[PDB]
Amino acid sequence: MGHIDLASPVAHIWFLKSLPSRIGLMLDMTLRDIERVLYFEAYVVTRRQLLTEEQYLTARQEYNDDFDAAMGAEAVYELLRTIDLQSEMTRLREEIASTGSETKLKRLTKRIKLIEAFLESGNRPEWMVMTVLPVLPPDLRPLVPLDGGRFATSDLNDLYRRVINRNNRLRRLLELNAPDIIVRNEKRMLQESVDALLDNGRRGRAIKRPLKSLADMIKGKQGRFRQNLLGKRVDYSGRSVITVGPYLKLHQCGLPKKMALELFKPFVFAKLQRRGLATTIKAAKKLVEREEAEVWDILEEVIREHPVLLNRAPTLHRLGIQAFEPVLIEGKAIQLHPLVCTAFNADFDGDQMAVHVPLSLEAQLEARALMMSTNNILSPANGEPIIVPSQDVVLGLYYMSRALENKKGEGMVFANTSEVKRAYDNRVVELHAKVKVRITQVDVDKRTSGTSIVDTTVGRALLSEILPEGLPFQLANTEMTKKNISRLINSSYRLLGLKDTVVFADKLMYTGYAYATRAGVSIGIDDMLIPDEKKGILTEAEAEVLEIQEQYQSGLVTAGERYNKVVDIWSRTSERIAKAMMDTIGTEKVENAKGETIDQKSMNSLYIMADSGARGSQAQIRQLAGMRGLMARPDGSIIETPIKANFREGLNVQEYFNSTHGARKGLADTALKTANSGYLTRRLVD
Amino acid sequence: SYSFTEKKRIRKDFGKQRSILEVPFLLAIQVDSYREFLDLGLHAALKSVFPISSYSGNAALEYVGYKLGQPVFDERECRQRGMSYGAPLRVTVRLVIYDRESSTKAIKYVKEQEVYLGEIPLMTGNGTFIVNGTERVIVSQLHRSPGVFFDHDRGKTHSSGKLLYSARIIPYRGSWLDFEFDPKDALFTRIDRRRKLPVSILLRALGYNNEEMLAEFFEINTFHIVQLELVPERLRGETLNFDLADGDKVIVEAGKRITARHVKQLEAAGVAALAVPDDYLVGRILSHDVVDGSTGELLANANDEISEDQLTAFRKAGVDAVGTLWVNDLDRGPYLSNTLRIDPTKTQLEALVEIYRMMRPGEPPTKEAAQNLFHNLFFTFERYDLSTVGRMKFNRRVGRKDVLGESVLYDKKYFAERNDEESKRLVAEHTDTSDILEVIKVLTEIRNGRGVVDDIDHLGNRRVRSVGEMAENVFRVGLVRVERAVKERLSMAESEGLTPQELINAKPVAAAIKEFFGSSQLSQFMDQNNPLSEVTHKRRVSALGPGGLTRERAGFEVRDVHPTHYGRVCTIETPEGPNIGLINSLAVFARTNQYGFLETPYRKVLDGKVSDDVEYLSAIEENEYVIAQANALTDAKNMLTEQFVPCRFQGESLLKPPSEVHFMDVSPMQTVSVAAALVPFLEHDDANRALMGANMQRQAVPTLRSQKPLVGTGIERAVARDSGVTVNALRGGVIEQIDAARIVVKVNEAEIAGVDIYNLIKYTRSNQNTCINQRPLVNVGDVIARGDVLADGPSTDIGELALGQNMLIAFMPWNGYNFEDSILLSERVVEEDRYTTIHIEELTCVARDTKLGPEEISADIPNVSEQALNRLDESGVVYIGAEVRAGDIMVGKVTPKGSDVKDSSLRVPPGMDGTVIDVQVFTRDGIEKDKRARQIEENEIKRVKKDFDDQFRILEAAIYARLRSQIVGKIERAQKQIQAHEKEFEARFADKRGKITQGDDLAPGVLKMVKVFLAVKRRIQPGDKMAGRHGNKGVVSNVVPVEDMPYMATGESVDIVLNPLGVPSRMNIGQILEVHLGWAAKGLGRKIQRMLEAQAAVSELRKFLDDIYNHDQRVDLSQFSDEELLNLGKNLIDGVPMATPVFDGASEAEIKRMLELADLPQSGQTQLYDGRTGEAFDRKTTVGYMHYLKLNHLVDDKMHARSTGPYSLVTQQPLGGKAQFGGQRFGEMEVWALEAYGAAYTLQEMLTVKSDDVQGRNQMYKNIVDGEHEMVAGMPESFNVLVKEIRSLAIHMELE
DNA sequence: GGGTATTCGCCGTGTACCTCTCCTAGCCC
DNA sequence: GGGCTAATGACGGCGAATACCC
RNA sequence: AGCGGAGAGGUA
Ligand SMILES: [Mg+2]
């Protein structure tokens, strides 16, 4: 690099404008006094005091050129040079032995620690001010040309040219023996220019946009520490659009053919060099871009057990980066396992993820031994496993593992699971019927086989063929809900092992898919039912609130207590409507058993998706069947009028405008919560 | 109706409510503001700055008028030339010269002959500005209105319960003025967010003493020294005192306070002056100075407490005039005395010196300069310029009776001493208003007088300024700059020795208007992919800009919706993500008022019935009247039978009897915008899913053959008409000739000699690389009317809007493919040319001159085989209509380096193929053209001669028919008009030849520039994002053959299989009802096609149309003709369209009746057999027709990969982006996710040897290609750059 | 003397991607 | 047109600096 | 011929 010879000294702004000001602790002065002194507005004699020009002339008229006083960088340079810190340490030690005030004690220990650090480091106190200022190397900043033979502007080059111009003007004015006022003005201008070069925007913000400096392109968002040190752009990467694929195992993922050709291109070159079909890399590259048939054979042969890395770009926890063994598929979309996307939290509405290719000899083992998807089964937060069946699997598993009152093919005794599978496919028995089957299950203490009898359904007997032998049938005889299948996955992972749990989670998704494609559930305008007494309860509440409004307008009850009792009886009416809707949805279906009618759980489209999980709560069913209650206001209050209509019935502009207030506030809260969660995650990491 | 464009297709509208006002013009506000911009607008900005008074030369000049010239270039030629669609602006000024050392008289009245300055971009088409060949639009800004509004901070200073209040006088464009309180009970001001200063400094700068300031606010109590006069209604509700008896009758004893009945008994007693004890007035404060009558010494000054020595001095002096301040505990606060006791400045000159020191920091003050600086801050017209809406808000908030007034602020004491000409005018109309003192008094009434506080959240405090006001502001800035330049240029001038055109310069005003229109925060690059996006981008208000808030700061209050937004600002069309709430949208019936506020129409409601009258109300006018909502049932044509109609008073929905209502809404489509009203059944779906659907419907792609939506709205005939994408007939008549790109219409004799001719636009490039085209629909010999359509544009139908295609929908989980918002397709969607659009990509290739030599486009290109030289012509340009592949050579170009040239030919981007449709060559003047440019020029002059003599023959035939219709009886005007039209056509042909043969505009430094247009047909593939109208966005999954798809009992195969798991999750139900209504429409269409397939009579078809059109909106099928009904039945072979309004929609009974009218089941859901196995299902599914749309988020512009790419110069790192081979950025959290696993070997290899190392990036490649495995670890180059940057800061850092 | 009481100033505010335009400028021949 | 020639619509938290009643 | 910085829009 290079340097600039300055005729006048100039002090650094990092040791002056900072809040623990080191010069103010060294010279035992304040910040405003040294600010007025260093910018040529006062005088320092050489004990230390603020002194203006009239005091200077009245002292020079009586001192007869015997009391010298300098102003600017020379005075603070002489004050930093002529001090002896070895005697000053003992003097401030006597000062801390004498003075006992608490803030004076804090300032004394701060000054003693600073002097101790300065004498231990060996640095001179005169090195705060500087005479020779170095510059950056010319390769560190480019002069990027534009279209038409132009040149783009820079930020540090203009400040450097301003510093060199002011230094040359000051040198010419010092050589030509200028009067003192213009020399002081040029020294002040050079001080402001150097202080703007070192940290722009801290003193005067020298420009309609303030350009960056040496302290702005390191500290901040666009600094070097957070752009080119921690996270750098790497090669052997690329994004795509995710697409769900059910015909692949959880230890493998899909990959486009052109992406696999562009990512593993040096491995293709090495394989073509080893096989001898191409002499040079240029002929091999021309054979690759000419797109023959042997190139795809080489590409299919070179990546068989070579793992890659997958990573969604918004990541939250440690399971955002996993490893898969890719296979070559068609199209331009990466195929992914459906059970992996629970950990990624990746919806399929056009989300992108960037891949990474480990190419060293140790990175493949590091990605296989501790980053494969068959090893990241449990979450780092709690002990529950992340392999939970999603919205499509648990619906078929809940439709398969329930029972009704009277169906065809019930009452008969079966032999084993194979007899059930042989009698189900030819449609001689129903999917769910109260039958008595015989199953064999081993006992672990150690393997101890045992044969007993049990009474269950046909679907739960068909589910007994894919579970491992370590699980008893009593953990699966209950209807497969969300928490029940989570407990079943945890019990399969606890006392059995890993690989059998992996293949059990592999077969469970295929069974759920093959039964969900046979069920054919659909929600329509006929399945969503309304309560019969809803209009009567609404008219009763309307008569009650009309009587309350008449008693309020007649002059008995104040407006606040009337509003409180109105929203109280409307919340009671909403709770009664929700209870009536749950009663008319859950106990809707009726059946007969040997002639006599019996009640049972209904098999409606909305009730199955509500009770099986992986959907909204009972509030989402209340908003679709009965009244949605009372909506809120952004300032904190509750609206007096209710919404006496569900989403099935029509809505007017008033309740829609009332619901918009609660709709937009949730979006704003999720945006602010995402920003604060990112900031809290960064602080908790650091 | 029964027009020509409406007799071809009639949609059945399910609208039970009446319509009092039709849907107005959509983009009328921008074109109205630009028409009003060209005395308000531009003329006020001219007249406010052009009076110039010279100092020494005494040379003044005044303008007399302005005139806009003719645009020399049409916009169709301006889109290809690359210049701006502008017009010359010539100002006609007059220059006078006053004779020095004499009377006020002019010497010569010399006037400049239309001196040219600036160039304004003319608004053409539908509101799109063209600056560099790209259509740019200027959205409207939503900022705070100028005026005075008050606010209070909650828990800001000292966490006290006493909320401090603040004031702010907002001007139009000038200096601000604030008034805030303090927890130390002292008012403080600040000017332009500077350091604070007490209020007594500004009042002393106004010219007010203390004895006239403190005496006008509070009342005075006269003391006689010490008995004082009993002020009535003063001690009531105040601090208690000792016993006071009026005539030895003490009604109130000691220790008690005067109540209301005690005050009444005291006022009914005839009070007088009572003997006040001496221990009461010691706590008061004197009002003014008290001096001796004989001596005259200042023993007691003003704003001082009355102690015992001052009391004895006043008793010795005998001064009976002792006034005190009426200071209570809560009703009266002594804030002015607390501000006066702090500042020690007593004179006006020291106050002006302190003002000049607080304004100019570090500068020596001057007594002659502070008076000049204080005059050009708040009391001048050239620097403050408070507009009329600010004066209206001032008079509305303060409480003045008159609305109009003076623009500049007026003071009583400041303008009384001035003897200027403008100062004598303001003091004659005003009556010492003292607006600053009135602001201080209103703030005092806010603090202690219990006033009201208004928050900045209404539409009465926010104004909407359009393109005209911002253009007038930037032209005012440029005019002030050119006025200063003209003042410096003509400070000393002669009579006629110099020209007036050399005084003013067009360069700063042209640079200012170019910087405003080219690159600013309000010039948004529009998206011309759809007519709906084109009409919703111009009708959009925003709060971001130079005069508003930014999206980076916190906006948690301004992102929430206010009850003022009902009817003026749409609450649905709001983009989610970073700025959710800051980018709003205008309503359907909303418009801009005369001041800038938003006004919405309402209906005048009489106390008995509702009248058919409209009246636009603003936001500050709806708080007084009780406006009724849409829940008003009607029995008669105008009647209210409800005892309690729901209405709103101040945004709170309450119940009121119908004898007190004043206003009612005009239409249920008042709340939503034009982009949210087209979604069918908006009342059933949730608000967030409707907000997602309104943005999913904004970025569609027009397909090849667009089909109409079966479930529409009925307001789609205006959103496609007001966008201007389709041509409309100005005068109806007979279509003489028609072609694929030209429509000739003959104007009839009613609305008439020259007939009109239209030129339809062919396949050109839009702003988002989308192909647009206009295809006609009428035939020859047709009789059209004024306002009908002739050609449908991209994604356009016969007069309704059509975005995509209708496909079959079956809600069923199909083998786990529809997993999480995933979409399954069929083979018959791909093979029937349904979702294959056309994208047009532009490629350029310039040829400049370097220091060695200029580059040519010759065909002798080295290292090029004959496989690519066959497509090139002799000139080096590829042939028109030639199929090009990925990586071929289209424009040959060589660069000399030094026989030995370097290849710099334009290459095709990979993965893109298609034909070359248009080749445009831009040559420089003075350079000889090649064979391709000569062929383009001869084809252009042949085509323009063809259209010229075709129009001449058409006009000659029209004139010959017009004279032949008149010479049949028993003349010169026809042949005179024919000769005039021939001369006009000859002049137009000469101008076209001179504009074609001239050298076009290029960049300074280039020689030749060619542009090649490509056309690629984008197919549908797995990985493509596709959404619906009800708000269900997702990606496609697979392309299944048609034999493996579910099928009904008839034989129809379902094309699209959805996921039924999203209905309870997203809580929307309107999509299933849309599916059922589309199924009913397809059933009626199939029944109509089955009835029309056989030779049946028209009477049964007319009875069927009368049964399906107007059930239990009344239209007659026997009105048009007998064959028009057959044409309408033939046009409805795919399904009769349904029109459902936004809030007055159809119930389930009408849709059930429509399902039962055809051969369809009642419940709308049937069973279907599987296609994989052939067996039946267990539960019946919903089958229907849902309208879909293809999004612009393609898969070709998303996926990419790279291994070796370019590196930078600062840090040895790869670039970023899909262009220029940029690798994907490894995030900061990805390194933490890697380090949570441990695995240091895959973290060191993915950080150092992959990208950052200058030696490891070659060594790892060499080890991979060769076969060995030996890596070298080292420090990256970025750490070396960081330590070399730290070493340049005089800080030693060495790697020890 | 002395021990806090406002008061001024410094510090900061998620990740990743896609597309478009516009930049140093100005001034008397 | 030309060629060298030089704003005021952010908000919360924490540490030093006079400074004011005691 | 590779490399730069601002302004606006959109998906997650
Ligand atoms: Mg997503």
Author numbering:
A (entry chain D): 102 to 147, 156 to 316, 321 to 558, 563 to 803
B (entry chain C): 3 to 40, 51 to 237, 243 to 769, 775 to 920, 940 to 1011, 1052 to 1193, 1199 to 1382
Give excerpts from the publication.
In this study, we determined a cryo-EM structure of Xoo transcription elongation complex with P7 (P7-TEC) at 3.95 Å and a cryo-EM structure of Xoo transcription elongation complex with P7 and NusA (P7-NusA-TEC) at 3.41 Å. The overall structures of RNAP and the interactions between P7 and RNAP are essentially the same in the two structures. Our cryo-EM structures show that P7 almost completely blocks the RNA-exit channel. In the structures of P7-NusA-TEC and P7-TEC, such gate is largely blocked by P7 and leaves limited space for even a single-stranded RNA. The structure of P7-TEC graphically signifies that P7 inhibits intrinsic termination by preventing the second step—formation of the termination RNA hairpin. The other side of the β sheet approaches to but does not make interaction with the flap domain of RNAP-β subunit (βflap) in both P7-TEC and P7-NusA-TEC structures. The structure of P7-TEC also reveals an incompatible binding of P7 and domain 4 of σ70 (σ704) to RNAP. P7 makes interactions with the β′dock, β′ZBD, as well as βCTR, all of which are structural elements required for σ704 to anchor RNAP core enzyme. Furthermore, the flap-tip helix βFTH—the most important anchor point on RNAP for σ704—is displaced by P7 and becomes disordered in the structure of P7-TEC.
P7 is the key phage protein to regulate gene expression programs of both host bacteria and phage Xp10. P7 binds to host RNA polymerase to inhibit transcription of host genes. P7 turns on transcription of late genes of phage Xp10 by assisting host RNA polymerase in bypassing intrinsic terminators preceding the late genes. The structures reveal a unique binding site (the RNA-exit channel) of the phage protein P7 on bacterial host RNAP, where P7 exerts dual regulatory activities on host RNAP—inhibiting transcription initiation and preventing transcription termination.
